[PDB]
Design an enzyme around this catalytic site. Structure first.
Site, PDB file in Angstrom:
ATOM      1  N   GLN A   1      41.190  41.029  46.187  1.00 29.38           N
ATOM      2  CA  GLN A   1      42.355  41.333  45.300  1.00 29.38           C
ATOM      3  C   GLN A   1      42.066  40.900  43.858  1.00 29.38           C
ATOM      4  O   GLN A   1      41.467  39.852  43.625  1.00 29.38           O
ATOM      5  CB  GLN A   1      43.622  40.647  45.829  1.00 29.38           C
ATOM      6  CG  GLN A   1      44.895  40.944  45.046  1.00 29.38           C
ATOM      7  CD  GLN A   1      45.332  42.395  45.155  1.00 29.38           C
ATOM      8  OE1 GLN A   1      45.457  42.936  46.256  1.00 29.38           O
ATOM      9  NE2 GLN A   1      45.579  43.033  44.013  1.00 29.38           N
TER      10      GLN A   1
ATOM     11  N   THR C   1      43.851  47.912  40.908  1.00 30.97           N
ATOM     12  CA  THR C   1      42.978  46.960  41.655  1.00 30.97           C
ATOM     13  C   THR C   1      41.966  47.712  42.507  1.00 30.97           C
ATOM     14  O   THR C   1      42.327  48.619  43.261  1.00 30.97           O
ATOM     15  CB  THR C   1      43.801  46.031  42.571  1.00 30.97           C
ATOM     16  OG1 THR C   1      44.673  45.215  41.774  1.00 30.97           O
ATOM     17  CG2 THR C   1      42.879  45.136  43.420  1.00 30.97           C
ATOM     18  N   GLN C   2      40.699  47.329  42.376  1.00 34.82           N
ATOM     19  CA  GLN C   2      39.633  47.881  43.196  1.00 34.82           C
ATOM     20  C   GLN C   2      38.634  46.788  43.552  1.00 34.82           C
ATOM     21  O   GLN C   2      38.892  45.599  43.359  1.00 34.82           O
ATOM     22  CB  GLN C   2      38.885  49.009  42.471  1.00 34.82           C
ATOM     23  CG  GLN C   2      39.598  49.671  41.310  1.00 34.82           C
ATOM     24  CD  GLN C   2      39.385  48.925  40.007  1.00 34.82           C
ATOM     25  OE1 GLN C   2      39.490  47.697  39.959  1.00 34.82           O
ATOM     26  NE2 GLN C   2      39.068  49.663  38.944  1.00 34.82           N
ATOM     27  N   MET C 107      46.705  46.308  35.544  1.00 38.79           N
ATOM     28  CA  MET C 107      46.203  45.938  36.876  1.00 38.79           C
ATOM     29  C   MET C 107      45.192  46.947  37.434  1.00 38.79           C
ATOM     30  O   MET C 107      45.120  47.170  38.641  1.00 38.79           O
ATOM     31  CB  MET C 107      47.372  45.727  37.853  1.00 38.79           C
ATOM     32  CG  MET C 107      48.276  44.566  37.469  1.00 38.79           C
ATOM     33  SD  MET C 107      47.405  42.990  37.534  1.00 38.79           S
ATOM     34  CE  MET C 107      47.360  42.716  39.308  1.00 38.79           C
TER      35      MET C 107
END
Ligand SMILES: [Mg+2]
Ligand SMILES: [Mg+2]
Ligand SMILES: [Mg+2]
Lengths: 222, 196, 233, 226, 125, 204, 195, 212, 195, 196
Positions: A1, C1-2, C107
C-alpha cells in the site's frame, strides 16, 4: 500500500525578544538512518519582515512555504502593496492548513517577526491549523529535549531568589539578541549530542526593524 | 502460457502453446493465443484472458481506423497503442503482451509489454509462466539473421521445454510466420515436439 | 496506488570544480529476475542537463516522454530556443518536482527516485533530487536506493562540504564515481556490470559515455575460503 | 552500530563505534562494543545490546571452563560453534549479530554470526546499521597481504564511514589487535573525532535557587552499639 | 525416591513399626480428656525434669485446630506438629469449600486417615 | 496499554567531586488519574542507592527482590555490597527474565567504600548496562531529562552545587511531562553522610 | 463489580461498596455484599471480573484465618496488605491472571492507628487517606481533596462519604443500587444498616 | 483539558485550563481555550484544537453578517445552531469538538449551549467538558446555587478547574476566567496553577493530602 | 438516546421518554425532552444516534408545518406516519443513514380515534396498541400484554405506564433519570408535570 | 542460490555460485555453499543459511559416529540422515539440499531433498532460486556417462546462465569433483564464465 507521508527529521526553534525575533533550525535532512543532505535550508525569508519554517515531512513543508510566499505576493497585488503584518500572516496560514483538514500537511509550522508595535513575535501551528502567539517554541524531532531547558533559562521556571527559599521568584529580566543566540546555540549543541537526527549545521535568521540577518554555525556531523 | 516472438532474416515468427487453465482444470486445450490486430501485425497474449482479449479488440479497432486515415501503421505504432492501454489502466489490468510485425522498410520487429506497461524493443522476446524455464536455453541458442527453418526449430524446441516443465502450458504449438511473402500458420502436435 | 513491476536500481552523482557527473546501470529487473539488460536510465535534455531515474520503468518511460514534449513545447514561438531561452537544469527539475508532488497528492504516484544533474547559464553546478513523495533536496553528492547507503560514503570522502568542490578535478571525480559503481556491483543483488556515465562541464559541455563496464574486480581471494566455520577441505 | 573485522599478515583486527541508541535518542555516547570471549578471542556485537553482551559472557564463561578442562588455550572455532548452536536453538529470538576474531595455536581467524545461527568466513567483514558504509570502504581499499599498520588504518577508516554516514553510529572508534605470538592489544577510544565544543554559557545556579520543603539525614549505617 | 516398605506384616500377623510407634506414645507425658454435661476438659502432664524453662514461649501441649476444636497428644513432639499443621490446613479448606466449620468427628476422621496412610506407604514410618 | 507508561515517573543520577546525587519524582497514576503523591522510587541497600521507574508493581517487586538478595549477600560475604557489584547483580537478575521481562528502568548510584570513587549506572528493562561518567536518566520524561542534563551538567561540582543542578534538571523535565511530578526527592551522597531533600514544586 | 470507596479518618477506616450485580442485560441482585472479613480488625472490599473476585477474596480470607490459628496472633494491616500484593503480583504473570482490585481497611492495634491500602490487579500498592478503584475516583476525589482532614470523626467521615455517593448517583450512567457501608476501628468491624 | 461554563444570577462564568499534550509530552502550558467569538459571545475549546479555533472564529463571521443583515444582536440559540448545523454536515469525516457556546441577550437571558461534533446541541445550566470534566463536576454540583455573587461564582469556577488540574494529568498550566454579562464578557485574568494551588491550600485548608 | 414508550388507550395516546443525556463517561443533562410536536394533534418521540435524532425530528417537524400552512389542513396521523416511514426508508440506502427510531402518537379528528405508530430507522412501520424501541419492550411488554384493555381510561393508562417505568428502574442497569410523559387527545397535546 | 550436482563416467561433480543475500544486499559475495559431510560425500545447500548449516553440522556428526562404528557410510545412508532431519522438522525448516557422493561399489550418486523432506535419486539435480531458469537448458544438454571435462563444461555453462538471470545468484562458480582419484576443488571467476 502507498504511504503519501514521510519523515525528514529536523528541529526548529523560535524565540521572541523585546524588539527582535529569531527563528533557528538545523540544516540536516534525513530518511530513516540515512543523511540526504548536510545543508538543506529549512528557515525562509518570506518578505515583509517575516521568517517561516514548516518542519516534518519536507514535501509538505516546501509546498506550504511556497503557497504562503505566493499569498504574500497576491496580498500586495490585491491591497495596494500593504505590508502583511505578522498577525495577519498567522491567520492566513491557518486557512492554508485547515484547507487540507482531511488530508493534512504533515508539518509543524513556526513563523517569526515583529508585531505592529515593533515588539518581537512568534506564532506556532499544528498540522491542521490551530495557532497561538508564543514567546518561546521549539518544533520537530528534538523539541522535547529543548523546551524544558528554555522554560528554565528563558522564563526562569523553578528558579527562586537565594535566601528567601521559594518565597520570591527570580525576576523575569529581558534578554538581548546576543543572550538569546547563546541559548539557541547551546540548545542545538545539546540536542545534537542526544538526538541522531540533529546535527551538521545550524542556521539562524534574526529579525529586527532593520530587516532580516543570517548567522550560520557548524554542528557535529556524526 | 508459453509465448515468444523471434525476428529472423526474412521477418518475424510468433509462437504459442494452446492451454488455458482455471486453477488445475484445463478449460481449453486447443486455444489460439496468436492474435491478429492488423494484416502483418500480430500479438501473443498472456495473463488474464478477458483483459488481453479486450485489449486486442480495442487495438484492432484503433489500427483499423488508423489505416482508413493514414495507411498501414508501423509495428512501433501498434506497440504504442498497446502500451497506452496497458500503462494508463495498469491498476485494473493483468496483461503481458508481445507485439510482432513485418514492415518492408523496417522488416521484422518485436516489442514486449510486461505488466507495468513499459515497452522494450528486442531481437526476440519470451513471456508467460512457462518462459521462466527457457531463459537459459533461449539466451544460449538465439542467433540474429537465422533462416525460416532455423527459427521454426528454435521456437519449436524452446516451447517444447516450456511445455515440459510448466503445468499451465501444453497442447499444440501454434506459430504464425510474418514475411514479405505473406502470412503462414503452422501447427505442431504433441507426438512431434515431445520426442525432441 | 500501485506497485512497481519492472524496476531500475541506484543512480549516483556528484559535483566537481567545473561541473557535475551522473551514472546509472543498464538493468531492468522483474523482481529477482534480471529481465532486461539494455535499459538506458540516464536521459539527456539538451546539452546542459541529464536526468537520472530509478524505480518503475514504465513510469520512467512516461517521464522520458514528458521531457521530450517539454523540449518541443519550449521551442514553440521561441527564437532564442537554442540560446538565452533554452531549458535550464533548474527549469527541468522544478517541472518534474511539481509533477511528482501532484501525483502523490492524488494518491497515484510515479514510482521513481530522480536526480537532475546539469550546469546553469552562469556556469553554476546544478544537482538536486526528487522522489515519488515529492521530497526534494540538494547536496555535493547525491544517490538513490542502494547508492545512498554505499556510494554516498565514498563520494563524500572526496567532496565532504561545499569548499571541497573547487579542489576536485574531473579526473578525480570520475574515478570516484566509477569505483562506487564497482562497489554497488559487488554488493547490490539488483545491479549489473554494464552502465552509462554522463559528464556535464561548463567548458567542454555534455559528454555521454555508453557501454561502460565494471573492471579491475577482486575475486582471487575466494579460492582460499572454505566452508562456513570448521571445514578445512 | 558499525563493526568491522580485517585480517592481516600475522593476525586479525576488529573495530567498532561507541554509540548506543534507544530509537532516535543516544543513550550512551561512549559505549563499549568490543567484548572479550577469552584473552585472545574478542568479538564485536550489533543488534540487541543485552543479548550480544549476555551471549558473549555465557560462551566466554564456558570457553574458560573448557580451557581449564582440556589444559589448552581456547580456539576461535569453539567459540563459533558454541555461539551458533546457542543462537540457532533460540530461532533468532536472541538478537545477537557478531563478528568473532582471534588467535590460537591453529592460527588467526575471522568469522561473522547472524542471530539465526548462520556463520561465514572472510578476510574482511562488517555488521550493523553502518555495515554498508563500512563495506564500501573495505571493498575500495582492501588487498591481500596487509601489514598490521595498514589493517588498523583500514578498519578505523571503515568505522569512520559508519560514524559520519550512518545515524545509528557515532562518537569514537574502538580497536582491538590480535597478532600471532603476542598479547592482544585493546585500544579503547583509538580515535576521538567528536569532542563537544565549549558551551556559550555556564549554567551553574546560585545556591538557594531551588525551593525545599524538608531536610533529613539518611541512616546508611548499620544498627549501632551501646 | 526412597520407596522401602518399613511397615510390614510379621508371621504372627503383627505390624511391628505400628506397635513400636505405640511404645513411643507410652513414653510421652500423660494426657487426659473428660467431657461434662456442657463442656470438655483437657488435662496434660508437664515433666518437672526441665526447670529453667521459659513457659511463655515453650510449645504448649494443647493446640487449637480451629476456634471450636482443640487437639492434645502423647508421644513424639516433633511428629505431633506435622499432624497439627495438616489438621489446621484441612479445617480452613473445609470452611472454604463446604462453608461450614468441621465437625469434631470429621476432623478426627481426617487426622486418623493421615496416620493410617503412614502405615502402608513406602519410605515412611 | 504500554506497560512502561501506565504509572509514570522519572529518576535521574549525577556525579560530582567526591559525591553522587540521585533524584526522583513522587507520582503514581493510573494513566490520566493521579493516585499517589508519596510513591518514592529511590531505595537503598547499605550505601548503594537504586532508583526504579516504570510499571509500579515491578518497581515494588524488584525492590523486595534486591533487598532479599543484598541481605543474603551481606550474611555470606560479611560486608555490604558495592555499587559496581550490585550493578552486575541487577543486570543478571533482569536478563534471567529475557522473554518475560520486568517493565522497568533502574538506576544505580553510590560511592565505593574502599576506593572512594563515585559511581552511577543505568539499565534497559532486560539488563544492558549504561555506565556513564556524567549522568543517567530514566522514565516517561527521559527525553526531557537528557535535554536538561546535557546543558546544565559540568564535571567536578561540589555537593551543594550538584544539588542545585540535579534539582533543576528534574523539576523542569517533570513539568514538561503529564505523567511525572506531584513532588520530588533529591539524595546528596558523600562517603559517610547522605542528605535527603524534598523539593517544593507545582502540583498539577 | 463496580464502585468501591475507602476513607481513613482519625480513629477508623470506612469502606463503601455498591450493591448491584449485573449480568449484561439484567440486574440480577441489588443487595450484594462485596467484602470479606480477613481478621477481626481487617476488612477487604473488591471489584473486577465475575467469579474471580469472590474466588480471590475467599482464598485470601482462608490464608489469613490459617495464619491466625497457627500463630494465635492477628497480622498487622500492613502485613496483610503485603501478602495480598504479592499474590496479585504473582498472578499477573500467570496463565490466567486474577482480574481483581481491592481495598484493605484495617485498624492496627499495636500502633492504635487506622490504615487504608489500595491494591490493583497488577499488584500496585499504595497507602492512602482515601482511595477508590475504577471510575469511582474520577467523580469523588475532588470532593475528598477539598473536605478531608486527618482529624475527622467517624460521623464526619460518613457525611463526606454521603456527599461522594450523591455525586456518583448524579453523574454516573450506571445504577449501582446504593452502597453497603462498613466501619473498621479498635472494637472491630460493623455495618451501618441505614445509608 | 478541562473546560466549564455555568449559568447564575449574575450571568455566566466560563473557566478553562491551559494545557495541551501530545501523548505524554506537554506541548504547551499557555493555550487559549476560550475563543472570543465576539465581544458578547464566548466558546470553549475541547477535542480538536484547530476544529474549535477555525469553526468558532468562522462562527464570529456568520454572527457579524447576521447583525449587519438583521440590524439586531444574534441570539445564543441562533448562533449555536449555525455551528451545530455546520458540523452535522461534516459528520463521519472526523471533526472533533466539544464546546460551550455562551451568551447573554435580552430575550433569552444568560444561555449556554453544549455543541458536539456528532451533531448534539443541548441547552443547559451547567456543562463541563474534557479529560478532567468529572473532577470539576464534583466541586460544581456540591457548591452551585443560582443566587451566587459574581465574586463567589468566579472563585467556584477557578476552584473547579484547580481540582481537575490537580488530579487529571492532561489538565493544568494556568486558569483563564471570564464573566459574561448582557453588555459583553469581562476577562478576569490568567492564574498560574502552581502558584494558585499553594495559595488555595493555605487559605482554604484543602488538599491536606499534599505536603506544602 | 435510551427509553421511549407508547400506549394507545380509549380516547388518547400516551408517550413516555427518558430525560437523561449521556456523553460516554458523564450524564450531561437530566431534563432532556426527546419529543417534537409535528401538528396540534400529532406528537413524535425519538431515540438513536446523537445529533441525528434532533436533526431528523426537526426536519420532519418543518415539513409537516409547511404542509399545514400550504393546505390550511392538518394531516391525519396515518398520513404523517407514512411520510416519516418513506423518509427513513429513503435514508437507509443513503451515503450516511439517519440512525433514528421514532414513535408517532396522534389523535385522528376525522375518525375520533387515537393512533400509535412505531417506526424504526430502517423504515419498518407498525400500528400498535402499545410499543417501544430498544430494550424498553423487553422489560415492559409482559406487563402490557397482561393488563392492557382497549377501553382503558387515560388515568388507567398512566397507572399501567407507572408500573412499566418501575420495572425499568428495577431491572435496567442504566440510570435514565426518569421520564417525561405527554398525552395526545382530541384537545391536543399536554405534559404531565408530576410523574 | 544456483546449485547442482551431476553424475558422470568417473563419479560425480557438485557446483554452486557464491552469493548470499539479505534482501537486495549481498551479505557475502564469496560464500562456499559446497559442504563436506564425509570424505567423499558432500552437499549443496539452498534456503535458509542458518537451517542448512545446522543440518549439515548434525549430519557430519551422525556420519562421523557411523564411521567409527560401522565403517564408511553409503551416499544413500547420508541422504537418509538428511531426509530424516528435513522430514521430521518440516514445520520449522526452510532447506533444499542436494547430496552427492562417490562409492567404489556404487560409483557416483545424486540425491535431491526438496522442501517437504522427500528423497529423489537422480542422474543429475538442480536447485535454488536460479535453477528455474536452466530447466530447459539442462534437460537438453545432459547426457549420461560424460567425461570429467564435459561435465565441468556442462555445470559451468548451466550455472553461468542461472547467474545471468537470477539476481540472488552470482560471484564465483565453485565446484568439487568426487572420483576414485580423490577430491578436487575448482573455482571459476566472472571474467571467465560471463563470456561463455
Ligand atoms: Mg553517525
Ligand atoms: Mg504441461
Ligand atoms: Mg494535572
Amino acid at each position: 500500500q502507498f504511504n503519501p507521508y514521510g519523515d525528514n527529521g529536523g528541529t526548529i526553534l523560535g524565540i521572541a525578544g523585546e524588539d527582535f525575533a529569531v527563528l533557528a533550525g538545523d540544516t540536516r535532512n534525513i530518511t530513516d538512518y540515512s543523511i540526504n543532505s548536510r545543508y538543506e535550508p529549512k528557515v525562509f525569508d518570506c518578505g515583509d519582515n517575516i521568517v517561516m519554517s514548516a518542519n516534518g515531512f519536507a514535501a509538505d513543508g516546501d509546498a506550504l512555504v511556497k503557497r504562503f510566499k505566493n499569498s504574500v505576493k497576491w496580498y500586495h497585488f490585491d491591497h495596494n502593496d500593504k505590508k502583511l503584518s505578522i498577525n495577519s500572516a498567522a491567520r492566513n496560514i491557518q486557512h492554508l492548513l485547515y484547507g487540507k483538514r482531511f488530508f493534512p500537511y504533515y508539518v509543524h509550522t513556526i513563523i517569526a517577526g515583529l508585531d505592529e508595535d515593533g515588539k518581537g513575535a512568534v506564532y506556532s501551528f499544528d498540522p491542521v491549523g490551530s495557532y497561538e502567539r508564543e514567546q518561546c517554541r521549539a518544533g520537530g524531532a528534538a523539541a522535547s529535549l529543548i523546551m524544558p531547558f528554555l522554560d528554565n533559562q528563558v522564563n526562569f521556571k523553578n528558579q527562586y531568589e537565594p535566601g528567601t527559599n521559594g518565597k520570591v521568584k527570580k525576576p523575569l529580566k529581558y534578554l538581548s539578541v546576543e543572550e538569546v543566540i547563546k541559548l539557541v546555540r547551546d540548545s542545538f549543541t545539546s540536542a545534537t549530542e542526544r538526538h541522531i537526527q540533529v546535527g551538521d549545521g545550524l542556521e539562524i535568521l534574526i529579525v529586527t526593524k532593520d530587516g532580516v540577518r543570517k548567522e550560520f554555525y557548524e554542528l557535529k556531523r556524526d | 502460457t508459453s509465448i515468444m516472438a523471434v525476428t529472423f532474416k526474412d521477418g518475424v515468427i510468433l509462437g504459442a502453446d494452446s492451454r488455458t487453465t482455471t486453477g488445475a482444470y484445463i478449460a481449453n486445450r486447443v486455444t489460439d493465443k496468436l492474435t491478429r490486430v492488423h494484416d502483418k501485425i500480430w500479438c501473443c497474449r498472456s495473463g488474464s484472458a478477458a483483459d488481453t482479449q479486450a485489449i486486442a479488440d480495442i487495438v484492432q479497432y484503433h489500427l483499423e481506423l488508423y489505416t482508413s486515415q493514414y495507411g498501414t501503421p508501423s509495428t512501433e505504432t501498434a506497440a504504442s497503442v498497446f502500451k497506452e492501454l496497458c500503462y494508463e489502466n495498469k491498476d485494473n489490468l493483468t496483461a503481458g503482451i508481445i507485439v510482432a510485425g513485418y514492415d518492408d522498410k523496417n522488416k521484422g520487429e518485436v516489442y514486449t509489454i510486461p505488466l507495468g506497461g513499459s515497452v522494450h524493443k528486442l531481437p526476440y522476446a519470451i513471456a508467460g509462466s512457462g518462459s521462466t524455464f527457457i531463459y537459459g536455453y533461449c539466451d544460449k541458442n538465439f542467433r540474429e539473421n537465422m533462416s525460416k527453418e532455423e527459427t521454426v526449430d528454435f521456437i519449436k524446441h524452446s516451447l517444447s521445454q516450456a511445455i515440459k516443465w510448466d503445468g499451465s502450458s501444453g497442447g499444440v504449438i501454434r506459430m504464425v510466420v510474418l514475411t514479405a511473402a505473406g502470412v503462414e500458420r503452422l501447427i505442431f502436435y504433441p507426438d512431434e515436439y515431445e520426442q525432441l | 496506488t500501485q506497485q512497481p513491476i519492472v524496476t531500475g536500481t541506484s543512480v549516483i552523482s556528484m559535483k566537481y570544480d567545473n561541473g557535475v557527473i551522473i551514472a546509472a546501470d543498464n538493468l531492468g529487473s522483474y523482481g529477482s529476475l534480471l529481465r532486461f539488460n539494455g535499459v538506458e536510465r540516464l536521459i539527456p535534455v539538451g546539452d546542459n542537463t541529464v536526468v537520472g531515474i530509478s524505480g518503475d520503468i514504465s513510469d520512467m518511460q512516461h517521464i522520458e516522454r514528458l521531457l521530450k514534449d517539454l523540449v518541443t513545447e519550449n521551442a514553440y514561438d521561441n527564437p532564442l530556443a537554442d540560446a538565452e531561452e533554452a531549458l535550464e537544469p533548474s527549469y527541468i527539475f522544478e517541472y518534474l518536482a511539481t509533477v511528482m508532488y501532484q501525483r502523490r497528492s492524488k494518491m497515484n504516484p510515479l514510482w521513481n527516485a530522480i536526480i537532475v544533474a546539469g550546469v546553469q547559464s552562469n556556469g553554476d553546478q546544478f544537482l538536486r533530487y526528487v522522489n515519488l513523495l515529492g521530497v526534494t533536496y540538494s547536496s555535493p553528492t547525491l544517490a538513490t536506493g542502494f547508492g545512498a547507503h554505499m556510494a554516498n560514503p565514498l563520494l563524500r570522502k572526496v567532496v565532504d562540504r561545499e569548499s571541497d568542490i573547487p579542489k576536485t578535478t574531473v579526473q578525480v571525480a570520475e574515478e570516484a564515481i566509477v569505483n562506487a559503481m564497482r562497489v554497488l556491483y559487488y554488493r547490490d543483488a539488483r545491479s549489473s556490470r554494464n552502465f552509462s556515465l554522463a559528464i556535464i562541464d561548463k567548458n567542454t559541455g555534455l559528454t555521454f559515455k555508453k557501454n561502460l563496464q565494471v573492471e579491475n574486480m577482486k575475486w582471487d581471494f575466494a579460492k582460499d575460503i572454505k566452508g562456513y566455520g570448521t571445514q578445512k577441505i | 552500530t558499525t563493526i568491522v573485522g580485517v585480517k592481516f599478515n600475522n593476525g586479525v583486527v576488529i573495530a567498532a563505534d561507541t554509540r548506543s541508541t534507544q530509537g532516535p535518542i543516544v543513550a550512551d555516547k561512549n559505549c563499549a562494543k568490543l567484548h572479550r570471549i577469552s584473552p585472545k578471542i574478542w568479538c564485536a556485537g550489533a543488534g540487541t545490546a543485552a543479548d550480544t553482551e549476555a551471549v558473549t559472557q555465557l560462551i566466554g564463561s564456558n570457553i574458560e571452563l573448557h580451557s581449564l578442562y582440556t589444559s589448552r588455550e581456547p580456539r576461535v572455532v569453539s567459540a563459533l560453534q558454541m555461539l551458533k548452536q546457542h543462537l540457532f536453538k533460540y530461532q533468532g529470538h536472541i538478537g545477537a549479530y557478531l563478528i568473532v576474531a582471534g588467535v590460537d595455536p591453529t592460527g588467526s581467524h575471522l568469522f561473522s554470526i547472524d542471530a539465526h545461527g548462520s556463520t561465514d568466513v572472510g578476510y574482511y567483514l562488517s555488521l550493523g546499521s553502518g555495515s554498508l558504509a563500512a563495506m564500501a570502504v573495505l571493498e575500495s581499499h582492501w588487498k591481500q597481504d596487509l601489514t598490521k599498520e595498514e589493517a588498523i588504518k583500514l578498519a578505523s577508516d571503515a568505522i569512520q564511514a559508519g560514524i559520519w554516514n550512518d545515524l545509528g553510529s557515532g562518537s569514537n572508534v574502538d580497536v582491538c589487535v590480535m597478532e600471532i605470538g603476542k598479547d592482544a592489544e585493546y585500544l579503547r577510544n583509538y580515535l576521538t573525532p567528536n569532542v563537544r565544543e565549549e558551551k556559550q554559557k555556564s549554567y551553574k545556579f546560585p545556591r538557594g535557587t531551588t525551593a525545599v520543603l524538608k531536610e533529613s539525614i539518611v541512616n546508611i549505617c548499620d544498627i549501632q552499639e551501646e | 525416591g526412597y520407596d522401602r516398605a518399613l511397615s510390614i506384616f510379621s508371621p504372627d500377623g503383627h505390624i511391628f513399626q505400628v506397635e513400636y510407634a505405640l511404645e513411643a506414645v507410652k513414653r510421652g507425658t500423660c494426657a487426659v480428656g473428660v467431657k461434662g454435661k456442657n463442656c470438655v476438659v483437657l488435662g496434660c502432664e508437664r515433666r518437672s525434669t526441665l526447670k529453667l524453662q521459659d513457659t511463655r514461649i515453650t510449645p504448649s501441649k494443647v493446640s487449637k485446630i480451629d476456634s471450636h476444636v482443640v487437639l492434645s497428644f502423647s508421644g513424639l513432639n516433633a511428629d505431633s506438629r506435622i499432624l497439627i499443621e495438616k489438621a489446621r490446613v484441612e479445617a480452613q479448606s473445609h470452611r472454604l469449600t463446604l462453608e461450614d466449620p468441621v465437625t469434631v468427628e470429621y476432623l478426627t476422621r481426617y487426622v486418623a486417615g493421615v496416620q493410617q496412610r503412614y502405615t502402608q506407604s513406602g519410605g515412611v514410618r | 496499554s504500554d506497560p512502561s507508561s501506565i504509572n509514570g515517573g522519572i529518576v535521574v543520577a549525577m556525579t560530582g567531586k567526591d559525591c553522587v546525587a540521585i533524584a526522583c519524582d513522587l507520582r503514581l497514576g493510573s494513566q490520566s488519574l493521579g493516585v499517589s503523591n508519596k510513591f518514592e522510587k529511590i531505595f537503598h541497600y547499605g550505601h548503594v542507592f537504586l532508583g526504579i521507574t516504570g510499571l509500579a508493581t515491578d518497581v515494588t517487586t524488584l525492590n523486595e527482590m534486591f533487598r532479599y538478595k543484598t541481605n543474603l549477600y551481606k550474611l555470606k560475604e560479611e560486608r555490604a555490597i558495592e555499587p559496581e557489584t550490585f550493578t552486575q547483580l541487577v543486570s543478571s537478575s533482569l536478563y534471567e527474565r529475557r522473554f518475560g521481562p520486568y517493565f522497568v528502568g533502574p538506576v544505580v548510584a553510590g560511592i565505593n567504600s574502599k576506593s572512594g570513587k563515585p559511581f552511577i549506572a543505568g539499565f534497559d528493562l532486560i539488563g544492558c548496562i549504561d555506565e556513564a561518567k556524567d549522568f543517567i536518566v530514566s522514565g516517561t520524561a527521559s527525553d526531557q531529562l537528557f535535554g536538561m542534563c546535557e546543558s546544565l551538567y559540568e564535571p567536578n561540582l561540589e555537593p551543594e552545587d550538584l544539588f542545585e543542578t540535579i534539582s533543576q534538571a528534574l523539576l523542569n523535565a517533570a513539568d514538561r511531562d503529564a505523567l511525572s511530578g506531584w513532588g520530588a526527592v533529591v539524595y546528596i551522597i558523600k562517603k559517610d553522610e547522605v542528605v535527603k531533600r524534598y523539593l517544593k514544586m507545582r502540583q498539577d | 463489580m463496580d464502585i468501591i470507596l475507602g476513607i481513613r479518618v482519625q480513629d477508623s477506616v470506612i469502606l463503601a461498596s455498591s450493591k448491584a450485580v449485573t449480568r449484561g442485560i439484567s440486574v440480577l441482585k441489588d443487595s450484594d455484599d462485596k467484602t470479606r472479613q480477613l481478621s477481626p480488625h481487617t476488612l477487604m472490599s473488591f471489584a473486577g471480573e465475575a467469579g474471580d473476585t469472590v474466588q480471590f477474596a475467599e482464598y485470601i480470607q482462608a490464608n489469613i484465618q490459617l495464619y491466625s490459628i497457627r500463630e494465635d496472633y492477628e497480622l498487622s494491616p500492613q502485613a496483610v496488605s503485603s501478602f495480598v500484593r504479592q499474590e496479585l503480583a504473582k498472578s499477573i504473570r500467570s496463565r490466567r491472571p486474577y482480574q481483581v482490585n481491592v481495598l484493605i481497611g484495617g485498624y492496627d492495634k499495636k500502633k492504635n492507628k487506622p490504615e487504608l491500602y489500595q491494591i490493583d490487579y497488577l499488584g500496585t500498592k499504595v497507602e492512602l487517606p482515601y482511595g477508590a478503584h475504577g471510575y469511582s475516583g474520577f467523580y469523588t476525589f475532588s470532593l475528598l481533596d477539598h473536605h478531608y482532614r486527618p482529624d475527622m470523626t467517624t460521623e464526619e467521615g460518613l457525611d463526606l462519604l454521603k456527599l461522594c455517593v450523591q455525586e456518583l448517583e448524579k453523574r454516573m450512567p450506571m445504577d449501582f443500587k446504593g452502597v453497603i457501608v462498613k466501619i473498621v476501628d479498635k472494637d472491630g468491624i460493623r455495618q451501618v444498616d441505614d445509608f | 483539558t478541562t473546560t466549564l461554563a455555568f449559568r447564575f444570577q449574575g450571568g455566566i462564568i466560563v473557566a478553562v485550563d491551559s494545557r495541551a499534550t501530545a501523548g505524554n509530552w506537554v506541548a504547551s502550558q499557555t493555550v487559549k481555550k476560550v475563543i472570543e467569538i465576539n465581544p458578547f459571545l464566548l466558546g470553549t475549546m475541547a477535542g480538536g484544537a484547530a476544529d474549535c479555533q477555525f469553526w468558532e472564529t468562522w462562527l464570529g463571521s456568520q454572527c457579524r453578517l447576521h447583525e449587519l443583515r438583521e440590524k439586531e444582536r444574534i441570539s445564543v440559540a441562533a448562533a449555536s445552531k449555525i455551528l451545530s448545523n455546520l458540523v452535522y454536515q461534516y459528520k463521519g469525516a472526523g471533526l472533533s469538538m466539544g464546546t460551550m457556546i455562551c451568551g447573554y441577550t435580552r430575550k433569552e437571558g444568560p444561555t449556554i449551549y453544549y455543541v458536539d461534533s456528532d451533531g448534539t446541541r443541548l441547552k443547559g445550566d451547567i456543562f463541563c467538558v474534557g479529560s478532567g470534566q468529572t473532577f470539576a463536576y464534583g466541586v460544581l454540583d456540591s457548591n452551585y446555587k443560582w443566587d451566587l455573587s459574581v465574586e463567589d461564582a468566579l472563585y467556584l469556577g477557578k476552584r473547579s478547574i484547580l481540582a481537575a488540574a490537580h488530579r487529571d494529568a492532561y489538565s493544568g498550566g494556568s486558569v483563564n476566567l471570564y464573566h459574561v454579562t448582557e453588555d459583553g464578557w469581562i476577562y478576569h485574568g490568567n492564574h498560574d496553577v502552581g502558584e494558585l494551588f499553594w495559595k488555595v491550600k493555605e487559605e482554604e485548608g484543602s488538599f491536606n493530602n499534599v505536603i506544602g
